[PDB]
Amino acid sequence: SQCVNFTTRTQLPPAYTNSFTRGVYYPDKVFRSSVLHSTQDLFLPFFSNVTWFHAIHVSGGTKRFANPVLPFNDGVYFASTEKSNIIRGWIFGTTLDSKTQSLLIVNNATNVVIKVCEFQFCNDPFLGVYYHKNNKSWMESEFRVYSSANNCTFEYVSQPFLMDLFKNLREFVFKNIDGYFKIYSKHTPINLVRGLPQGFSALEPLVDLPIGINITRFQTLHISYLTPGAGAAAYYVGYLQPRTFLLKYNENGTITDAVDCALDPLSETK
Amino acid sequence: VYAWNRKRISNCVADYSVLYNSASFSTFKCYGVSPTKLNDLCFTNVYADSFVIRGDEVRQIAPGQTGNIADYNYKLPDDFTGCVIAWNSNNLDSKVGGNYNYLYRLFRKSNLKPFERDISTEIYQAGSTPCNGVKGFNCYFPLQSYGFQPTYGVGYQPYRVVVLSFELLHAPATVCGPKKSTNLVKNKCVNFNFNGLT
Amino acid sequence: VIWMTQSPGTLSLSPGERATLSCRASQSVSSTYLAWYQQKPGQAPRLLIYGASSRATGIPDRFSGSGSGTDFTLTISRLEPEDFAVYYCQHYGSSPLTFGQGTRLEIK
């Protein structure tokens, strides 16, 4: 599709948050019952410095608030808190142009689309929906994310569904290792209004794909609500590191709690 | 054949046995692999190259071949690793008045490299004087028609050819053969293999 | 169509004499597209000259061609007894390819 040009480009300054004890995810598909297992892998270290930003979905009023492209390193913990599903997709790669193979992930209203091609992303990739007054339902009508898509290397479309248009915290972990791009996901109802909730949660495995591409940077994509003319989503990003972790599988195999060995000497003893 | 179609196949299981037992194949030649072993192999990508030629030109689609089809229309590498399937389409691609829609490249300065497609219609310069887009003496249209008819000989009858090429790179494989699965056995010492876990 | 006109129609000469035959095209032609032939009675034509001046393989040095545009010549510098024959010019640069009517070379 053809990109839409915005005269004004702006981005909110980053802020910092305490990761608390989140980012724990099933390192493998193994089933363990009532047992402690020590695994050495890429995790978000406990109480890490998480870079967090805001995601504005409505303009009201000609300023385009641009999400910033951020480095990837060895994998990221991306959390999003919002009422309606404002966050829609992400873009990954090295140069994010037709020169190098680049990935686009999106969960639109219809189905989940993941495409690895030499995309030429827009300066401000745009997802626009309008309220159908007669049908009393918001309906997606604008999708301008990449100007071009050539030499497509991979594509994957989930079954078509309907996305709805007390907050929801959706946590995701993206790790590209050994030519495999693995996405872990977890969905929770959060009553906290602002700031990362403090507590434990296991991010279930969601999908592993053998796309086998080199990725070093990424950017987040938000929805735009077209209105005739304040609840901006909040998204936090942390970076994984190679750490040793002690995971406590309960009877059913759900990760009840984890210990970060290198956090503090008490954890070393643990 | 000069504009032979190519489709890329990946991220799917290739069922070779049923594919090879579907129709009656007048020509089935695989090089570098047996037809049965493909059910056991994984490859990065698959390429399906489809076209139509004459019967007598079918021999041109093989490694190390030469000829009009081999040199100017479709070229295979000498080390080709893949399969070639060809079957008569006289009841499909032949017309009473002649099926002239199928074309082939006749004049070309140099032979095609393997898996190189030439769709140029520029007037071929067969003499010293330039053609300047004008066909005439020493200036001929590079493409020639087949004009298949149902009453032609099988050598002149149309033949549909599909070349299956197996690209195996140092990347995670996307296409594999069919997985077999035996019946389950319980309460007995057995040699199990669940989803590759032995 | 380009027409070729030879002159003379008959030439009578003795062995040892020089022969010169003329061929005129109805319009200007490239010299690259002019040939000369000898024909003996009951034999096929034999190429002597191509490209107005290039001698064919195994033709004697006494034979030479020249000219350009409309006007071409065949010269035989010293006639031998085997040279008494009919000679034809040809334009071969476009269809139809055309011959002259011939010049008959006879012993005087």
Added chain:
Amino acid sequence: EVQLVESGAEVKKPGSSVKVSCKASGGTFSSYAINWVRQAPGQGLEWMGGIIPIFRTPHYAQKFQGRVTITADESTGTAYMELSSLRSEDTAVYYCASPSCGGDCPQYLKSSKLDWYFDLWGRGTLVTVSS
């Protein structure tokens, strides 16, 4: 060795057709420039037409258009000239002739093809047309 050999002599009636053959030997027949030239008794040379078999596009002199058909069989290395609606004026010796490449010798790009001989005129077949 490169040679042209015509079919034997023919005797025909006016209004009928004649088909003469020229067998070429030596080199690749598909790229062989075969020309037909006739000579009536006591007359000059007349080019009738020719073909290079690979292009399947025969050329004819305007005088013979609609009466002459030139074809080539690549499997036998043989060119044919058919002349229809015969007249007494079609009594002639019919030669096949292929000067190296006929009308496609000068090609100094695609390949070499810088060969030009002088011994490629068939001896000729006599066609007699009489009532």
